[PDB]
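Re-running the complex after MR caught last week's input typo. The corrected sequence lines follow. Everything else is unchanged.
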Amino acid sequence: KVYYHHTGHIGGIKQATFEEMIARRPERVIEIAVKGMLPKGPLGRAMFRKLKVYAGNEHNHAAQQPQVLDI
Amino acid sequence: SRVAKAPVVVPAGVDVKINGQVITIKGKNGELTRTLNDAVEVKHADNTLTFGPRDGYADGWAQAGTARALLNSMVIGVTEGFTKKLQLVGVGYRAAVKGNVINLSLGFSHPVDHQLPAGITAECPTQTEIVLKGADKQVIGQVAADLRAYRRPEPYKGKGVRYADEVVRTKEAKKK
Amino acid sequence: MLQPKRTKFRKMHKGRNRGLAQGTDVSFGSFGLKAVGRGRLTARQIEAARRAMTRAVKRQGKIWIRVFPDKPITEKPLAVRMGKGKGNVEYWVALIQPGKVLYEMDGVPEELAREAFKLAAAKLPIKTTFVTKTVM
Amino acid sequence: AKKVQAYVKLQVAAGMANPSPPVGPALGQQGVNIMEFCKAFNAKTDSIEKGLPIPVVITVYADRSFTFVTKTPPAAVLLKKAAGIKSGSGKPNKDKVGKISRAQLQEIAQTKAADMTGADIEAMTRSIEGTARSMGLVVED
Amino acid sequence: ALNLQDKQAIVAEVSEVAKGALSAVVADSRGVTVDKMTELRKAGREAGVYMRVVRNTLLRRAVEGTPFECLKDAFVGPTLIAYSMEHPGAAARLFKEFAKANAKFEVKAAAFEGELIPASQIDRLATLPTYEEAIARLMATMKEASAGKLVRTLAAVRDAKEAA
Amino acid sequence: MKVRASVKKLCRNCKIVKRDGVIRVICSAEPKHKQRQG
Amino acid sequence: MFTINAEVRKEQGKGASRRLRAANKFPAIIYGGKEAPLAIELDHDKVMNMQAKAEFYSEVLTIVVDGKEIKVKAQDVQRHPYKPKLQHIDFVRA
RNA sequence: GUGAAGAGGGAAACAACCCAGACCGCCAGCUAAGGUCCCAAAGUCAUGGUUAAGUGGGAAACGAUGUGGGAAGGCCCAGACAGCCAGGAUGUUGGCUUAGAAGCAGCCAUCAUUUAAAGAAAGCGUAAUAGCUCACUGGUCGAGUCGGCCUGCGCGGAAGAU
RNA sequence: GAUGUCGGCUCAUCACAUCCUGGGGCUGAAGUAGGUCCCAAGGGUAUGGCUGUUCGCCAUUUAAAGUGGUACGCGAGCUGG
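Corrected-run output:
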């Protein structure tokens, strides 16, 4: 699981480690995990934009009073 | 299979402290002697280690001998201390220890700069003799392996650092 | 290698098998190799299989061979279309079918006969299994 | 591996241990000095005639220090001598190049007596029967 | 179960002669080294002493099937046993021929007509006098071990503890 | 040494060991027998 | 040597015999003597690992069905097209 | 048979496949094949078996010291399973061969000796002895193990223009 | 009721089953040298002649003169040689 892309240049598939996606921008590992589970284009873009992860143990929604959930 | 059935029966005055799956072996005259059993589950009883299956793995008897081996290794680690006399065959290479630094040559223009972990010490009788001292059976071979990385006992004329099991079998020169 | 001496006619239909064999048990030997399932053999394997067994067994006992390529099979040349009479003659075929024993032995010691029969199976285009006769 | 071997074989004429080729290469590979071995080898051969093959069995220690037993000649040498054969057939039993009586084997057995391990003068003889058989010699009762 | 009788048969066999033996000698080695041994095996059959090198599985099982005197405490660890049922002086002499080429401390014990014979006493048995002195030494051995020996041991433990 | 497929035993001290999903022949008599695939 | 048990065939025809082989059972028959051929069902893997020794055919058999015993030897065997599993075996009274 | 001359459901869109034969309208229910964590409607199912490959959910020849269950059966505390150490011997260094010929360069021998014990050697190596493990014996060692067969699961073999 | 080519200029791009450095294993490899060689798309990979030439022959450079595909790349780019 190396998050495959081919933006437009140089022979090869191009890639990105499993290690970047948690070590740098740590939100992205969850974002592109729930993404493929949502319908077509537009309604999944409105579903998707309701999630935020931030960097981690530094969330900013103190004032909304979040209800804790254990999974 | 005889050593996958082995009950260990740990010696007296070794304190064997179990968090279930991590076992940390403590006692007199040594430091850092441990196992995390991960393919197999180990119950200690009073001193009689018992080997069986762990959740989420499939191999059976395969890792159960391994977990037995590793706990006993550690128990040997803290009691007596495992063997220590290391040596090298071959001219102009050496394995001379000097403090924290093992001074050797490979014909290289930079220092090879092989150094001892902060968890061991050593000293030297001669420039081709190393005696390493400590109580973890893993670590003494663990610095020895970086010393052997580029200095392995070769299968023809045999030169390298010589410790434990060694691969040299003798080989012949091109035929006359 | 085993083949028919002469034949009634020069050209015959390719055929197929209905899904059973009748020499499924060993009856010439006291052990043998069974085909598992089905397919075609190009007579090249009969030769290679006897050769494979004789280099391993040599002058200890006899071999009995049970496949013979009684049927002609044509290939249609690349320059000639279909619907134009049958092609030039290409290979002679023995048809193996489910349970057909291929090779049988007795004279050779059984464990040496087992090694010899593993070897013939590498020359064959499909997986096979060794069969023993017993008392009955 | 420690590099200790018990009971290393060597077979060389009593007068031929001054050169290295009758010794062959194998002592040399295990660190036995051919000159030192030649002073050790002449010390038990002085009463044997030169060119007559001397049995020598060597034990070697880890540091290639060595100890040596030199023996009176083989039963095989004497069994060839006593039947009047120069050399054997190279086939035991099936090829015959002579025959030898039991009373001759018994005289061999006694010449071999300190080397022999046997509990019986009968036992000692029983050992050299199969040596006679190897050289194409019939042991007749 | 065994498939063969050989491993069970030799246990009964060794207890049978070794309970009988007028002298036997009990020793330790785990690799005796053959040169010395082959020649003492020779010399034992010259004296009419019989010699076995024999397993602890076998020895423990020997104790189990047949009752033993004075030999069952020296069975612990790797053990050779040389033993004679006739000419008892030879069993102990064979060890004094072996001692010339070996450790004379390698003896644990001996037994004599069912009496336990200690590592020190057996050296005296191995002397082998001619016959008037021999029969008189064999009796000296037995008389000593029955009742003198008891008093000997009870002194040998006391000295070690004794402090000044 | 060649990579190959299908493993057979070149000497009595080829241990033959499955690291991940690939069988390596690892030997401790001679290093010559070190076949990468079985 | 070998001591077995057997049941008498409740239904015969293709459908019953397939329902044996679906469940790792197979059929058999015992002929000879002055008396009728006796049709029985057997278990496949009870007898497959007995018949690994030759005495199942060479030496006489204990076979119990309804407390009746007649003494028997095994005869020739029928095997599946692509499995060595026993499709049907014949037996003779001995 | 189906499409041709038929909707819908399932398959990712898939003329002919699996289910079914659409009068029309039904913001009513069940059921088929197929599904049941989310795309997507329902089982992260209850009870028991097994496995490391994203196998599952991509296929063969072929192959081994990959791993479990089962019954029948040998071994089985009278010591297994079979590794490590130590001994590895007497004739003997068999015979021939050869510099010399030593189990192992080749071919013939396939035996004998005190023995509780050691194949005139199972495997390596050596231009070839040499050096080495090995059973057996006797230390360690104190309980399960494997061949035949039925049975779950693995493996590398399985690299191409976006 | 239209997928239209060779040869020659221009311009490329993707698969690595790599011409090569780079880390490492074997060798009947001592080291050199040769044989065996896994990892690996990252990057470089020559020019004049003759002929309408793919391919041929010849002269020559450089450590070197690659493998596969593209309506057998490319006239809604170039030219009928």
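None of the earlier attempt is carried over here. Residues 24 and 31 of chain F are 12 Å apart (CA to CA). The two ends of chain F are 13 Å apart (CA to CA).
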